[PDB]
């Protein structure tokens, strides 16, 4: 029995994305954030292509396809970054990209140190919880369906169905090698707790990037086209409470 | 927009 679903997730997983950062220059707030913004712009393209290739995604109304990506990109990218940090440098640093690795000094220089420490904590959890590559893939996919508008999507029912199916796939991945129903429940508890922990981080980053865009001209930080549009149009819907994450607990 | 164009 070939695992079709996981086969697909592995196949569509985005390759390496570089930020284009000049590491030969002394670190500066403006340069680091401008590079993170460009990295975001570059990653957004890969996330869109990735999402459109996910099982069942095309079934969502096109407007909803765009909206869910516009609302979930921060969480998705932060989660993938934590995994890269864990696998590449054992969480010793934040591995945003091969050419953009943050040690504590850079975390401080970026003016979002607390957020960076929380992301480092997220990265360590992949190790502490012994998250498998297959669990990572399924969890990352679920993150794309974890934040919706209070007013509902154009075809909310299709979204609910898709989300349920991805949760079911996570159940299957958990059940693999687990004959004890209690061990499966305990694992599901751990993974949903981890998924929930991504949201508070994403929200703090949403707040930070929103404030930065508003004063970007004052601090010499450049925002690429898509990033500027999304942070000025969709992100505010999240910050104002019109779009909310779907938490498993609490 | 540039983002929306990813669907064209
Ligand atoms: C999503 C990115 C870039 C992709 C990634 O690896 C995670 C990282 C998390 C912090 C984001 C950054 C993109 C640019 C942002 C949004 C800055 O404006 C402030 C927070 C930054």
Author numbering:
A (entry chain A): 669 to 918
B (entry chain B): 99 to 106
The authors write:
The androgen receptor (AR) is the cellular mediator of the actions of the hormone 5-α dihydrotestosterone (DHT). Androgen binding to AR leads to activation of genes involved in the development and maintenance of the male reproductive system and other tissues such as bone and muscle. AR is distinguished from other nuclear receptors in that after hormone binding, it preferentially responds to a specialized set of coactivators bearing aromatic-rich motifs, while responding poorly to coactivators bearing the leucine-rich “NR box” motifs favored by other nuclear receptors. Structures of AR in complex with FxxLF, LxxLL, FxxLW, WxxLF, WxxVW, FxxFF, and FxxYF motifs reveal a changing surface of the AR coactivator binding interface that permits accommodation of both AR-specific aromatic-rich motifs and canonical leucine-rich motifs.
To understand how the AR AF-2 accommodates tryptophan residues, structures of AR in complex with peptides containing tryptophan substitutions at the +1 or +5 position, or both, were determined. In FxxLW and WxxVW, the −2 serine forms a bidentate hydrogen-bonding interaction, making hydrogen bonds to both Glu897 and the backbone amide group of the +2 residue. Thus, tryptophan substitutions are tolerated, but they induce a shift in the peptide backbone that precludes interactions with one of the charge clamp residues. This suboptimal interaction is compensated partially by interactions of flanking residues with the AR surface. In contrast, the +5 indole group of FxxLW is rotated almost 90°, resulting in burial of both rings of the indole group, as well as the formation of a strong hydrogen bond between the indole nitrogen and Gln730. Binding in this orientation appears to be highly favorable, as the FxxLW peptide deviates from helical geometry at the +5 position to do so. The equilibrium dissociation constants (Kd) were directly determined for the interaction between the AR LBD and FxxLF and LxxLL peptides and one variant tryptophan-containing peptide, FxxLW, using surface plasmon resonance. Surprisingly, the affinity of FxxLW, with a Kd of 920 nM, was slightly better than FxxLF, in spite of the presence of the tryptophan residue at the +5 position.
